[PDB]
Design an enzyme around this catalytic site. Structure first.
Site, short mmCIF file in Angstrom:
data_model
loop_
_atom_site.label_atom_id
_atom_site.label_comp_id
_atom_site.label_asym_id
_atom_site.label_seq_id
_atom_site.Cartn_x
_atom_site.Cartn_y
_atom_site.Cartn_z
N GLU A 5 4.18 1.21 1.91
CA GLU A 5 5.44 0.83 2.55
C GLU A 5 6.68 0.92 1.65
O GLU A 5 6.86 0.12 0.74
CB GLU A 5 5.29 -0.58 3.12
CG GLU A 5 3.98 -0.78 3.92
CD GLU A 5 2.87 -1.45 3.11
OE1 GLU A 5 2.89 -2.69 2.97
OE2 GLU A 5 1.97 -0.73 2.60
N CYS A 47 0.78 -1.23 0.00
CA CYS A 47 0.00 0.00 0.00
C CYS A 47 0.81 1.29 0.00
O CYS A 47 0.69 2.10 -0.91
CB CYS A 47 -0.95 0.03 1.20
SG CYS A 47 -2.16 -1.29 1.25
#
Lengths: 786, 786
Positions: free
Chosen positions: A434, A432
């Site tokens: 990271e 997402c």
């Protein structure tokens, strides 16, 4: 300047239809095969068992080439379907066998024959999974904290880890034979009478067997391609298949030497990774950086064919799926695989790295219009205007793509975490939001979800929940006379649960290293071959663990409410608030109104924004205290996937006016309808949080009415909004651009809106595949205009 | 001054008759119990599985109290029988189920019911044993080296490790509750957020569970005692059983506070160790040092009863047995457990430590006259004359007891291996001749047997054996022109095989750590509780691995013959000798005669004694190069158990005149009838070897005609022989004092000589229980007079 988008070939439409017309199901081949192999390797070390199992799977797994495909390789017979991974967990599957096709969202079919064949699988793996060993390593106190509905560590508990961006570039250059030769050299170099070499040898041999099985797998497609060609009528399709056979033969063990070969080899690497394990978030990362050289040197390819090849990969990325249990499915709704692919940005030298492939990736998103891949773009001070505007056009298309990431904040944040400046500048995004340096990290970028709002409940109720003392027994709320006392109890509750969440993660970490070391994946991440250690054993250059905090806005709004209304203005007594909250505002809507009218996060009001900042910081500071078994540090993340809805249904009424059972805010976004001062004011509030410490990433969602992006002017405004937010040190931002009417219609007549794509949180999903509770959350999100 | 020996009570003769009249058999209870438990702990970490298994075993294993026993605790229902240990290996047992009766050697009976019950055991443990993982960890080349009759690592491959002297003293003072509290305290100390604590906690909890199981084991005997007492007529036996019940109750978890309690608790500690694992050489060690305090402080006990209790322990030590496969049984013939108990010596301060119990131990050997325990005495410069003379009297009895050990050599040798001077001074002997500091070591004192004569054979044949190149292709013997070229080829062959022997040992080491860490045993050895690591994982303060070289005399005699007859005097060419040896001296006895008449080891002839020293040193220097997985070093030993005979049958004719298939020399003793210059000349020759480097122990056998020990004068001659050998730096020596006619009679009419005990090598055995091949070797040993 709007340039518009080109049109995809008819083949792309054919292939896209295959995905959308597919009926997701659970196949049993892999489960059967891995069980078969394990029964025969009982007396072998875990690493060899894993290698031999991959070998057995890749040599016997069914092989499929769907009609019209240019890039071949399918993990399941039925498109967009899921294989099973008994090695991590499987009892949950045995419990849901008959209700999988009865789901409101993320439904899966399963033949009566598959159900029958899994019986033996369930029987054999009893007590032999990673999840069962993980539980055994945990202390009793930790097992309890795990079942208090405060946090969840199920992600890596029930399934694979993943969340990594392998070094695709290296494998494309030297092929599988290169990886094998490197391992063979190490085996020769480190040969020694030192006992330590014993385990290193088994690891290296395991790597060789793995890459060898990989070569066999590719050759199998090569043969299958011919068998189809020999029996295909029209010379056009026959010719394509003979080319496919030829390409697969070359990249069989060698490295790519043409754009077509690079695309196929790239897909095989990605595919095999997904066969070895089912951890998701296997992110291609900087696809435009390592694919460009192959495009530039290919003197015989046309931009049209190059684009078509890319569009095919976009579609193949959508062919992979993964079945999860009922609960987990609420954490990852919409058949999400989270394969993040990022474009643009700067190189290790600090110069802009935008190239043609960077633009073809953005084009593909429009050509395919599917949920995957999770297309992203990197933005920095010197980002070319044309590039940012082009990304703005894509955003206008309403797919929720792309997600934007700020180099200016991320780079410094990564260096502070130990990455060299060169490695930091070369980051890609995992899942997402990271960030990590591809080919060198074992990040565990989503090791848990922590419910921040739940800590507020515990602080008000002194650790007592339902009918048991689940957290520390902190000072009674009723006896508090200052806000400082409240903040101390809050931190005390935070500390206790973060400790157990991390401890739980570490037990799971040990379990994976003990029962599921991955030979194949490890061969593509730096230092593994050099150190003779797997990813699970700390072979990676960089090691982290990333737990997510959920409910930022709810925490900020709650703290300011308690501070202002209870302690500052004394409108309510602690005792009154506690009762009102425990009763869910029943027969006391006057108090709820008072709470709802309190200052809200997302309106550029510093009094609240600072408490949202501090509230989040208490969480982030607790996480920084921990270390994982791989010698790495834990780093905080603030994103929610779709768990904000599930978490909200398990949280009582909170001091910000939210009623029990309602969804929590998504990521670092303001709560529904609380941001009533425009998009800009909201961005100013969010940028006040500490986006540097939350180095595992923070997620910010914003939804605009379509009219706000109309014309070149609309594109100009979106760019300014983005740049302004990033200049103020924002981490990430992504936008939904849809009319509420279309979403409402989709709920009434799904059949007519099968191709409707909407942004959830860090990823886009097929709207009609999401549970109603998630759809409604998205619909309820604040809608802005500029 | 002979003082003769006192007489044992009638009870001792009755208990003794139980052992001699028993018919050794293989029982199935333990095998069934551990299998059942392992099936239920599949999801647990290895250390927990071992703790839970011991618990299940100790709670459900049949309890047995034999008639007239004062010290209770039996491992098998039938006396002198064996339990089964599937966890290490078991396929060999499945293969021999029907021929365990037909054995000429260590015969075992097995009911038809036990055979049936073991079926499930065999089926479950397939691929789950330590032996199977050990093999898997080995390389291809190492697996081959292991199967070409040069060395054997079977001991710890097919069964448990053992070879340890636990800290009996500590458990006697603090009891099982003490260990438990110490573990609980550590659990509170080390408790931290550090990931490393996770595995330490599991270990410590495993220790708790184990000691707790041990406590209930003792209580079960307490209950059984009464159950029997309530059903016995004569008040005398009834009273004893009620006393046994009290004692087992106190010692149940607390430390001893009377000589009787100390004796009973001692045996329970020893017995339980043999239930957890079947590694032999579990040595009581300095029994007289830690048992004396309890004897001295007991004011209500008579020397007669104290002695009877000791005699009972002696008999109990003979109740334990262990079945081994056909082959391994040739390595350890005579139902040997090698439980070494030593008396006398100096304390850590360097003062003599002879005490009352020291003498009762010697007395017990005459009262019981059984193979166990392997009684030994420590001798140093200030050993009291009465003590040495009393040991001499015991030797005259012809039991082969006691073995003598030289403190003057051993202490320095141990300090150079890393022990503090205080720990070295407190050494005890493990198994045959292996020294260690009790309660602080994991020595692996018999990790392998290496055939030295076999290397001489490979040197002459250039690594070619039978029909294949099994060793390095060293210089062709026929083209050798000097002895130096020969020694270089000898060292090259030695190096190759020692390397693989040690590497194989290391793989087995890792296997035990991975699948059989012992929670109970580890709890009684220093640093384990403190480090939170098991013995198998390096928890011990001191760590070693000890491989034995076999055939010292054969190597010395062979090297001098090659050097003298071939290179110095040119009597025969290399090519001729090679041909003659491969032909086993057929049609060339003139050459054999020439070789037999060359100088022999054991006659105080430096020319040959030095080559014996040098030949052995080559072996010892190679072994010193290696380290084990526990961070310890390898140390050479030179003893053979009974494998000199087996090794002999696998070795062709050698340059010393020995024909193909004949036994090799035992330990560092001169070969049969080659020492024709008296006992003293033989001692001088053996003392010329480097006994300090072979810190894992060297064994020297000598056999005297009964007339040599007749009268006080005989006792004084034996004392001087010993003194002279030790002053010249000899390590150990033990004597057989028996008439040849008695052994021959025993072979003719076994029934008449069932109590005839004889010294094999580092241990005594019941002559008639020994295979004929081993009997003949003993009979053939040189007989000396003084």
């Amino acid at each position: 300047i709007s340039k518009g988008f080109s049109t995809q070939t008819e083949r792309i439409n054919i292939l896209k239809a295959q995905i959308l017309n597919a009926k997701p199901c659970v196949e049993s081949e892999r489960a059967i095969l891995i069980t078969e192999s394990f029964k025969q390797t009982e007396g072998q070390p875990a690493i060899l068992r894993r290698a031999l199992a991959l070998k057995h799977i890749l040599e016997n797994i069914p092989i499929t080439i769907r009609d019209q495909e240019l890039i071949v390789g399918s993990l399941t017979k039925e498109p967009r379907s899921s294989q099973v991974f008994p090695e991590f967990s499987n009892k949950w599957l045995q419990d849901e066998l008959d209700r999988l096709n009865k789901r409101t969202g993320d439904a899966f079919q399963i033949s009566e024959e598959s159900k029958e064949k899994l019986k033996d699988v369930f029987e054999y793996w009893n007590g032999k999974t990673t999840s069962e060993l993980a539980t055994s390593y945990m202390t009793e106190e930790t097992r309890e904290a795990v079942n208090c509905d405060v946090f969840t560590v199920g992600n890596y508990y029930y399934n694979g880890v993943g969340h990594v961006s392998v070094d695709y570039g290296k494998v494309l250059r030297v092929g599988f034979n290169g990886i094998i030769n490197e391992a063979k050299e190490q085996l020769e170099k480190n040969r020694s009478i030192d006992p330590d070499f014993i385990k290193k040898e088994k690891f290296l041999n395991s790597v060789i067997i793995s890459c060898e099985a990989a070569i066999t797998y590719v050759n199998r497609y090569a043969k299958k391609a011919k068998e189809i060609a020999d029996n295909t009528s029209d010379a056009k399709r026959k010719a394509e298949l003979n080319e496919i056979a030829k390409i697969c033969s070359k990249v069989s063990g060698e490295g790519a030497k043409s754009f077509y070969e690079a695309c196929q080899l790239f897909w095989f690497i990605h595919a095999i990774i997904n066969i070895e394990s089912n951890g998701h978030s296997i992110s291609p990362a900087r696809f435009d950086q390592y694919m460009y050289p192959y495009y530039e040197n290919d003197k015989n390819i046309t931009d049209k064919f190059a684009q078509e090849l890319i569009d095919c990969i976009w579609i193949k990325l959508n062919d992979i799926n993964k079945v999860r249990d009922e609960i987990s499915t609420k954490h990852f709704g919409g058949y999400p695989m989270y394969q993040n692919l990022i474009v643009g940005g700067q190189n290790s030298e600090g110069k802009d790295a935008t190239n043609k492939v960077s633009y073809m990736a953005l084009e593909a998103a429009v050509h395919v219009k599917l949920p995957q891949p999770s297309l992203s773009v990197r933005i920095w001070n010197k980002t070319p205007d044309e590039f940012l505007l082009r990304a703005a056009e894509l955003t206008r298309e309403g797919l929720g793509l792309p997600a934007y990431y700020n180099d200016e904040v991320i780079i410094p944040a990564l260096v502070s975490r130990g990455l060299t400046l060169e490695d930091a500048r070369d980051y890609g995004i995992i899942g997402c939001v990271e960030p990590q340096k591809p080919g060198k990290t074992e990040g565990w970028h989503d090791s848990a979800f922590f419910n921040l709002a739940r800590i507020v409940e515990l602080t008000i109720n002194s650790g007592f929940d339902k009918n048991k003392q689940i957290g520390p027994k902190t000072q009674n709320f009723e006896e508090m006379k200052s806000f400082d006392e409240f903040m101390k109890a809050y931190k005390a509750q935070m500390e206790y649960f973060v400790k157990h969440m991390c401890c739980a993660d570490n037990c799971i970490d040990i379990a994976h290293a003990e029962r599921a070391p991955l030979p194949f994946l490890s061969s593509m991440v730096d230092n593994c071959i050099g150190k003779g250690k797997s990813l699970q054993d700390g072979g990676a250059e960089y090691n982290f663990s990333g737990p997510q905090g959920v409910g930022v806005a709810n925490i900020g709004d709650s703290l300011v409410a308690v501070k202002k209304i209870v302690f500052d203005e004394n409108k309510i007594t602690p005792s009154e608030l506690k009762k009102t909250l425990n009763n869910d505002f029943k027969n006391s809507e006057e108090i709820q109104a008072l709470l709802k009218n309190a200052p809200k996060f997302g309106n550029d009001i510093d009094e609240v924004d600072n408490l949202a900042r501090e509230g989040a910081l208490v969480y982030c500071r607790e996480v920084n205290k921990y270390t994982n078994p791989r010698g790495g540090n834990f780093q905080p993340g603030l994103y929610p996937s779709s768990i904000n809805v599930y978490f909200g249904s398990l949280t009582g009424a909170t001091p910000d006016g939210r009623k029990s059972g309602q969804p929590l805010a998504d990521g670092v976004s303001p709560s529904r309808g609380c941001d009533v001062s425009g998009p800009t004011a909201a961005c100013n509030s969010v940028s006040k949080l500490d986006h540097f410490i939350a180095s595992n990433g923070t997620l910010f969602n914003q939804k605009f009415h379509p009219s706000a992006l109309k014309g070149d002017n609309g594109l100009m405004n979106l760019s300014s909004l983005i740049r302004s937010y990033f200049d103020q040190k924002g981490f990430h931002v992504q936008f939904n651009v849809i009319d509420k009417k279309i979403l409402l219609a989709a709920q009434k007549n799904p059949e007519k809106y099968q191709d409707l794509i909407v942004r959830v949180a860090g990823y886009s999903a097929q709207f009609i595949s999401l549970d109603k509770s998630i759809q409604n959350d998205i619909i309820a999100r604040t809608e802005h205009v500029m």
